[PDB]
Protein backbone atom coordinates (compact mmCIF):
# COMPACT_ATOMS: atom_id res chain seq x y z
CA UNK A 1 0.00 0.00 0.00
CA UNK A 2 3.14 2.19 0.40
CA UNK A 3 4.59 2.74 -3.08
CA UNK A 4 6.90 5.53 -1.93
CA UNK A 5 7.86 8.16 0.66
CA UNK A 6 5.03 10.58 1.40
CA UNK A 7 1.26 10.81 1.78
CA UNK A 8 0.83 10.96 -1.99
CA UNK A 9 2.09 7.38 -2.40
CA UNK A 10 -0.43 5.50 -0.27
CA UNK A 11 -3.10 3.26 -1.83
Amino acid at each position, epitope marked *: *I*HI*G*P*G*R*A*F*YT
Partner: antibody, heavy 123, light 112 residues
Framework: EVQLVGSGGGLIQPGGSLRLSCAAS????????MTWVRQAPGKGLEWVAV???????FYAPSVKGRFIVSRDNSKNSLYLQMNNLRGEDTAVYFC?????????????????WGQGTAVAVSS | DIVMNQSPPSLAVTPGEPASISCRAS???????????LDWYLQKPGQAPQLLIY???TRASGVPDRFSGSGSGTDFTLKISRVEAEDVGVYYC????????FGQGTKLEIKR
Protein backbone atom coordinates in the same frame (compact mmCIF):
# COMPACT_ATOMS: atom_id res chain seq x y z
CA GLU B 1 7.62 12.68 29.18
CA VAL B 2 7.40 11.74 25.48
CA GLN B 3 10.72 12.09 23.65
CA LEU B 4 13.39 10.75 21.36
CA VAL B 5 16.95 10.51 22.56
CA GLY B 6 19.51 9.60 19.94
CA SER B 7 23.14 8.57 20.22
CA GLY B 8 26.01 7.00 18.39
CA GLY B 9 27.67 9.01 15.71
CA GLY B 10 30.87 10.98 16.11
CA LEU B 11 33.97 10.91 13.88
CA ILE B 12 34.18 8.28 11.14
CA GLN B 13 36.66 7.91 8.27
CA PRO B 14 35.46 8.13 4.62
CA GLY B 15 34.12 4.81 3.36
CA GLY B 16 33.57 3.55 6.91
CA SER B 17 30.19 2.61 8.31
CA LEU B 18 28.32 3.93 11.35
CA ARG B 19 25.07 3.24 13.23
CA LEU B 20 22.93 6.00 14.74
CA SER B 21 20.61 4.99 17.52
CA CYS B 22 17.51 6.69 18.85
CA ALA B 23 15.22 5.54 21.63
CA ALA B 24 11.61 6.41 22.33
CA SER B 25 9.92 7.24 25.63
CA UNK B 26 6.24 6.83 26.47
CA UNK B 27 5.35 5.61 22.95
CA UNK B 28 6.21 2.66 20.70
CA UNK B 29 8.57 3.23 17.78
CA UNK B 30 6.71 0.34 16.09
CA UNK B 31 3.44 2.25 16.18
CA UNK B 32 4.33 5.40 14.23
CA UNK B 33 5.89 6.39 10.95
CA MET B 34 9.50 7.36 11.74
CA THR B 35 11.85 9.67 9.81
CA TRP B 36 15.53 10.61 9.71
CA VAL B 37 16.24 14.25 8.86
CA ARG B 38 19.77 15.67 8.66
CA GLN B 39 21.27 19.13 8.42
CA ALA B 40 24.67 19.91 6.92
CA PRO B 41 26.75 22.52 8.78
CA GLY B 42 25.29 25.98 8.12
CA LYS B 43 22.94 24.55 5.49
CA GLY B 44 19.26 23.69 6.02
CA LEU B 45 17.01 20.70 6.63
CA GLU B 46 17.26 17.60 4.41
CA TRP B 47 15.07 14.49 4.74
CA VAL B 48 16.94 11.18 4.57
CA ALA B 49 14.83 8.14 5.40
CA VAL B 50 11.39 7.01 6.48
CA UNK B 51 10.26 3.76 8.05
CA UNK B 52 6.53 3.13 8.01
CA UNK B 53 4.66 1.10 10.65
CA UNK B 54 3.22 -0.57 7.56
CA UNK B 55 6.67 -2.37 7.25
CA UNK B 56 8.22 -0.37 4.37
CA UNK B 57 11.33 1.79 3.83
CA PHE B 58 12.33 4.58 1.42
CA TYR B 59 15.37 6.83 1.11
CA ALA B 60 16.45 10.17 -0.36
CA PRO B 61 18.22 9.57 -3.67
CA SER B 62 21.47 11.02 -2.31
CA VAL B 63 21.92 8.14 0.11
CA LYS B 64 19.74 5.25 -1.18
CA GLY B 65 21.66 2.01 -1.03
CA ARG B 66 23.99 3.17 1.71
CA PHE B 67 21.60 3.90 4.58
CA ILE B 68 19.11 1.51 6.22
CA VAL B 69 16.19 2.17 8.62
CA SER B 70 15.64 -0.53 11.20
CA ARG B 71 13.61 -0.60 14.40
CA ASP B 72 13.82 -2.82 17.44
CA ASN B 73 10.41 -3.76 18.92
CA SER B 74 11.99 -4.86 22.21
CA LYS B 75 14.60 -2.12 22.63
CA ASN B 76 12.10 0.56 21.49
CA SER B 77 14.69 2.08 19.19
CA LEU B 78 15.00 3.45 15.70
CA TYR B 79 18.24 2.91 13.87
CA LEU B 80 20.06 4.42 10.92
CA GLN B 81 22.76 2.16 9.56
CA MET B 82 25.02 4.40 7.46
CA ASN B 83 27.34 2.64 5.04
CA ASN B 84 30.18 3.90 2.87
CA LEU B 85 30.22 7.47 4.07
CA ARG B 86 31.16 10.41 1.84
CA GLY B 87 32.02 13.84 3.25
CA GLU B 88 28.69 14.94 1.81
CA ASP B 89 27.20 13.01 4.70
CA THR B 90 28.75 14.95 7.58
CA ALA B 91 25.85 16.70 9.27
CA VAL B 92 23.55 16.55 12.25
CA TYR B 93 21.04 13.74 12.19
CA PHE B 94 17.56 14.08 13.68
CA CYS B 95 15.21 11.17 14.04
CA UNK B 96 11.60 12.29 14.14
CA UNK B 97 8.20 10.78 14.80
CA UNK B 98 5.84 11.55 11.92
CA UNK B 99 2.58 11.33 13.84
CA UNK B 100 0.56 10.09 10.88
CA UNK B 101 -1.19 7.02 9.55
CA UNK B 102 -2.17 7.31 5.86
CA UNK B 103 -4.25 4.19 6.55
CA UNK B 104 -6.82 6.30 8.36
CA UNK B 105 -6.89 9.89 7.14
CA UNK B 106 -5.23 11.55 10.09
CA UNK B 107 -1.91 13.46 10.08
CA UNK B 108 -0.25 15.56 12.83
CA UNK B 109 3.19 16.60 11.51
CA UNK B 110 6.66 15.77 12.78
CA UNK B 111 5.39 15.53 16.37
CA UNK B 112 8.57 14.57 18.21
CA TRP B 113 12.23 15.15 17.32
CA GLY B 114 15.50 13.94 18.85
CA GLN B 115 18.16 16.30 20.18
CA GLY B 116 20.22 15.50 17.10
CA THR B 117 23.51 13.67 16.91
CA ALA B 118 26.51 14.80 14.88
CA VAL B 119 28.40 12.81 12.26
CA ALA B 120 31.78 13.88 10.85
CA VAL B 121 33.27 12.09 7.86
CA SER B 122 37.03 12.70 7.77
CA SER B 123 40.48 11.34 7.03
CA ASP C 1 10.04 16.36 -7.61
CA ILE C 2 8.28 19.03 -5.53
CA VAL C 3 10.38 22.09 -4.76
CA MET C 4 9.62 24.67 -2.07
CA ASN C 5 10.68 28.31 -2.28
CA GLN C 6 10.73 30.38 0.89
CA SER C 7 10.49 34.18 1.06
CA PRO C 8 12.26 36.07 2.36
CA PRO C 9 15.60 34.57 3.47
CA SER C 10 15.66 37.02 6.35
CA LEU C 11 13.47 39.62 7.99
CA ALA C 12 13.83 41.85 11.03
CA VAL C 13 10.81 42.60 13.20
CA THR C 14 10.15 44.68 16.31
CA PRO C 15 8.39 42.77 19.12
CA GLY C 16 4.70 43.60 18.79
CA GLU C 17 4.90 44.08 14.99
CA PRO C 18 3.49 41.29 12.80
CA ALA C 19 5.63 39.09 10.61
CA SER C 20 4.74 36.99 7.61
CA ILE C 21 6.78 34.30 5.86
CA SER C 22 5.91 32.80 2.49
CA CYS C 23 6.25 29.32 1.05
CA ARG C 24 5.64 28.51 -2.58
CA ALA C 25 5.44 24.97 -3.94
CA SER C 26 6.32 23.52 -7.36
CA UNK C 27 2.98 21.70 -7.43
CA UNK C 28 -0.25 21.77 -5.48
CA UNK C 29 0.08 20.48 -1.93
CA UNK C 30 -3.68 20.00 -2.14
CA UNK C 31 -4.47 16.32 -2.08
CA UNK C 32 -7.58 14.62 -3.42
CA UNK C 33 -8.51 13.87 0.21
CA UNK C 34 -9.57 17.51 0.59
CA UNK C 35 -6.56 18.67 2.62
CA UNK C 36 -3.47 20.85 2.32
CA UNK C 37 -0.26 18.96 3.13
CA LEU C 38 2.30 21.56 4.19
CA ASP C 39 3.98 22.13 7.55
CA TRP C 40 5.77 24.96 9.38
CA TYR C 41 8.68 24.35 11.75
CA LEU C 42 10.71 26.58 14.10
CA GLN C 43 14.37 25.77 14.61
CA LYS C 44 15.59 27.88 17.53
CA PRO C 45 19.42 28.21 17.46
CA GLY C 46 21.12 24.91 18.34
CA GLN C 47 17.89 22.97 18.79
CA ALA C 48 15.84 20.38 16.97
CA PRO C 49 13.08 21.73 14.75
CA GLN C 50 9.81 22.11 16.62
CA LEU C 51 6.46 21.79 14.87
CA LEU C 52 4.35 24.88 14.55
CA ILE C 53 1.66 24.12 12.00
CA TYR C 54 0.58 20.95 10.16
CA UNK C 55 -1.96 20.47 7.34
CA UNK C 56 -1.27 23.96 6.01
CA UNK C 57 -3.40 25.74 8.57
CA THR C 58 -3.69 23.77 11.82
CA ARG C 59 -1.60 24.88 14.80
CA ALA C 60 -0.03 22.10 16.88
CA SER C 61 -0.58 21.30 20.54
CA GLY C 62 1.23 23.93 22.56
CA VAL C 63 1.87 26.46 19.81
CA PRO C 64 0.70 29.97 20.85
CA ASP C 65 -2.40 31.63 19.36
CA ARG C 66 -0.10 34.16 17.61
CA PHE C 67 0.93 31.58 15.04
CA SER C 68 -1.41 30.98 12.13
CA GLY C 69 -0.92 29.27 8.81
CA SER C 70 -2.91 30.06 5.70
CA GLY C 71 -2.83 29.31 2.01
CA SER C 72 -3.97 26.60 -0.36
CA GLY C 73 -2.95 25.03 -3.65
CA THR C 74 0.67 26.10 -4.19
CA ASP C 75 1.05 29.41 -2.29
CA PHE C 76 1.33 29.50 1.51
CA THR C 77 1.90 31.91 4.38
CA LEU C 78 2.95 31.53 7.98
CA LYS C 79 1.99 34.54 10.04
CA ILE C 80 2.96 35.71 13.49
CA SER C 81 0.45 38.33 14.61
CA ARG C 82 2.67 39.75 17.37
CA VAL C 83 6.33 38.73 17.41
CA GLU C 84 8.10 38.12 20.75
CA ALA C 85 11.80 38.24 21.50
CA GLU C 86 11.78 34.43 21.65
CA ASP C 87 10.32 33.86 18.21
CA VAL C 88 13.85 34.40 16.97
CA GLY C 89 15.29 31.49 14.99
CA VAL C 90 14.86 29.94 11.55
CA TYR C 91 11.48 29.01 10.12
CA TYR C 92 11.23 26.14 7.62
CA CYS C 93 8.25 24.89 5.64
CA UNK C 94 7.99 21.22 4.69
CA UNK C 95 5.71 19.21 2.46
CA UNK C 96 5.12 15.49 3.19
CA UNK C 97 3.42 14.73 -0.13
CA UNK C 98 6.09 13.79 -2.67
CA UNK C 99 9.10 12.61 -0.71
CA UNK C 100 9.84 15.08 2.10
CA UNK C 101 11.17 18.50 1.08
CA PHE C 102 11.94 21.69 3.01
CA GLY C 103 12.05 25.39 2.16
CA GLN C 104 15.45 27.13 2.15
CA GLY C 105 14.49 28.54 5.58
CA THR C 106 13.79 32.03 6.92
CA LYS C 107 15.88 33.81 9.58
CA LEU C 108 13.71 35.92 11.87
CA GLU C 109 15.55 38.65 13.76
CA ILE C 110 14.39 40.90 16.55
CA LYS C 111 14.73 44.65 16.47
CA ARG C 112 15.51 46.49 19.69
Amino acid sequence: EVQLVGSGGGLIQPGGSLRLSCAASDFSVSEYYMTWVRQAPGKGLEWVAVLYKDGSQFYAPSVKGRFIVSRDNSKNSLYLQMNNLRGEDTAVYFCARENADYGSDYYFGMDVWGQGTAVAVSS
Amino acid sequence: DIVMNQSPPSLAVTPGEPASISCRASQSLLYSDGHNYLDWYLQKPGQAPQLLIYLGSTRASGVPDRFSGSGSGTDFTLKISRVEAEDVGVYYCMQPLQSYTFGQGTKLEIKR
